[PDB]
Amino acid sequence: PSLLKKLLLAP
């Protein structure tokens, strides 16, 4: 749930 992981998960 980190900000970088949220970028990676963005569709």
Added chain:
Amino acid sequence: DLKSLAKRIYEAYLKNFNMNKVKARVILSGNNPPFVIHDMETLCMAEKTLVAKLVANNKEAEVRIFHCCQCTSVETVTELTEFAKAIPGFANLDLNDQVTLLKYGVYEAIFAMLSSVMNKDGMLVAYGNGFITREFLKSLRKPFCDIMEPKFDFAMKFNALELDDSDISLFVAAIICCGDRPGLLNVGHIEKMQEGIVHVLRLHLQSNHPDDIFLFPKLLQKMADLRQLVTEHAQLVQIIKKTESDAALHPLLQEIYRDMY
């Protein structure tokens, strides 16, 4: 098939970065011409036209400039994440290893790619619509005058290699797919993926630059140089954080810098 890996990485680079070296050279050669920022008057003019929302209310000019620096980095991290997701094999890595590779690779890739918008006199900013002079950045009060000059120094020697976008795309992929980053879960798998990309880079350079028999080891050294450049940059950013209370650090960049070096 190795040609296919190179082509797929080049295509992913052209799709995902707003600036590439051809686009930058068209602008720097002289619709939408770049506004030149060479002093405080022209900084303030540029701000009102290109980042109007930032100054619609102001904090020292150096702090506003550093804010724009960070905003550029945040945008480039997004571009690098999308690029990474299109690197063949990257999406098959453990999600947490993907995060780790981005964490440790984005600023090395940022400063490598920054070279494409730099010449000896200045650099393109704001999606190609501003050109800020190297002397003006040197003129800023300490510590802010210390941010960009080492990046210009790196870029002048990097640009003398006369790489094109097909080279740089593979170079940036190799930066991201580094098996020796701290905290990786599947080192062996990442080392093998990296080996594949580095293999394609070596062959591509042999074909695209038949005049320079050392170009591949030159670029291996540039990767090492970029690691040192980033460590030093992180140290300066920490000085800014503790001594420049008005210079708010963006939370994504804070996350990248945390527990890095």
